[PDB]
Design an enzyme around this catalytic site. Structure first.
Site: not given
Ligand SMILES: *c1c(F)c(=O)[nH]c(=O)n1[C@@H]1O[C@H](COP(=O)(O)O)[C@@H](O)[C@H]1O
Ligand SMILES: *c1c(F)c(=O)[nH]c(=O)n1[C@@H]1O[C@H](COP(=O)(O)O)[C@@H](O)[C@H]1O
Lengths: 259, 256
Positions: B89, B91, B94
């Site tokens: 997870d 996430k 960038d």
């Protein structure tokens, strides 16, 4: 716009954050508003760059999660170099989870980011719980945080109301938030720093959505404080002379805005 | 509305999605366990005891105090034994050039052990582009974060619509969403929903909870992601079974 204050004077503002004032004072002293994006995969190259380029930079930005041979002792060597050359350490972790999770990602795990990072940054998409969570570890550790109000990449959704939301959140958490990642000045309050990635001397991009603007455009025309430069410097043959080029560009653009 | 088994066979389905959908059907589970613990021993003991009850085990390896790649080898063994997918997870949020390295490299080598990862759409489609450069070759899938469960979330309206478009345009790599409801009408896409507990509430840091029946039954999602609702219980196995039966029934009732 109100009258523009020097970095040294901003470092003394009533509402300035301690970390921000430390930064502002070393920028003035060193005549640098350049943040090096030390995007390397080996601890050796990172420490070699931090040491040689330290005199030229206000800040060294890391992505510790791409260092093939990370240990906490490399961050000890980095801190020594930071203290010797006088720059801040910014872990570019771009936190983007719920408050309860980001708190642990910041304090714990293998990286223990809060132990060695003067600054970190966070996206505002999860809402203010992201800052509240980070605060719980950051405030006792005397650290600061930057909120990502705008991004440099093609198709970025950090625009309009999203950017306004980032500013509002920053204002409401001024004891921890010291400024923004942005492409432009986004707050009129001089206590806030603006740091801008997506910077190179020459026009262009990469093949994965990165877009570049010049130091003169970013600092001079767009009103940001600090340029963040990775590949513009790291890919150059002489990284020291590249760092000096970027430093002199960003500094002069700041002086002319001042000016 | 098609069963998980039938969706596993859809013409456009990603092989990771169909492996998931098949084991969900076989095991009668649409529960993803959010194994939010800091010790490798606890993570492994959870994956082993709860493995039969879950379709997916979601990790935050950057919270594991004693992460090693050998821990992830031991988690893979359990994933294969009990038949669940591993979801990091992470996430990602960038630019494409950076996420590529964050996904493939560093200490964690996420791509080497994670069947699935997720990514925020805020940076624009380069984040998907960079991830897929590593993930496609390794036959991985990605979920896009179209909505978040937290108070003040900006992943709404036009933002959510952007996430859906991005997924559809990267259907070779993107297998679904992290969302609070069905956001797409295409049955090839999975919907996974965090912020789930049996009781009403939230936490002290902006988390909001809805029930499995609300999330799967009323809002049209596929899989509940449940952390504290299970992890904080004394008997984690019985908690997991409660969540499994809730989520499974809700799915069957929507299917009916
Ligand atoms: C982060 C971010 F939030 C942006 O909006 N843009 C951006 O580029 N980053 C990060 O900054 C550095 C830019 O490096 P360069 O393109 O100069 O090599 C990278 O570390 C990227 O992750
Ligand atoms: C991630 C995310 F993108 C959300 O929108 N909401 C969300 O909670 N997360 C993560 O999911 C898990 C929920 O855990 P619980 O509150 O059940 O303990 C956490 O791992 C959080 O990071």
């Amino acid at each position: 716009a109100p009258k523009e204050l020097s970095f040294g004077a901003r470092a003394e503002l009533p509402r300035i954050h301690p970390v921000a004032s430390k930064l502002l004072r070393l920028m003035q002293k060193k005549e640098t508003n350049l943040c090096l994006s030390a995007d390397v995969s080996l601890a050796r190259e990172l420490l070699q760059l931090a040491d040689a380029l330290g005199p030229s930079i206000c800040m060294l930005k890391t992505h510790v999660d791409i260092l093939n041979d990370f240990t906490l002792d490399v961050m000890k060597e980095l801190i020594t170099l930071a203290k010797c050359h006088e720059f801040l350490i910014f872990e570019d972790r771009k936190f983007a989870d719920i408050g309860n999770t980001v708190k642990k990602q910041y304090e714990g795990g293998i990286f223990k980011i809060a132990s060695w990072a003067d600054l970190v940054n966070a996206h505002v998409v999860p809402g203010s719980g992201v800052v509240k969570g980070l605060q719980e570890v950051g405030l006792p550790l005397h650290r600061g945080c930057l909120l990502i109000a705008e991004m440099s990449s093609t198709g970025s959704l950090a625009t309009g109301d999203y950017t306004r939301a980032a500013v509002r959140m920053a204002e409401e958490h001024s004891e921890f938030v010291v400024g923004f990642i942005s492409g432009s000045r986004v707050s009129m309050k001089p206590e806030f720093l603006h740091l801008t990635p997506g910077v190179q001397l020459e026009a262009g991009g990469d093949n994965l959505g990165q877009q570049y603007n010049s130091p003169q455009e970013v600092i001079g025309k767009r009103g940001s404080d600090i340029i963040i430069v990775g590949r513009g410097i790291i890919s150059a043959a002489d990284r020291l002379e590249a760092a000096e080029m970027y430093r002199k560009a960003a500094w002069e653009a700041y002086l002319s805005r001042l000016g």
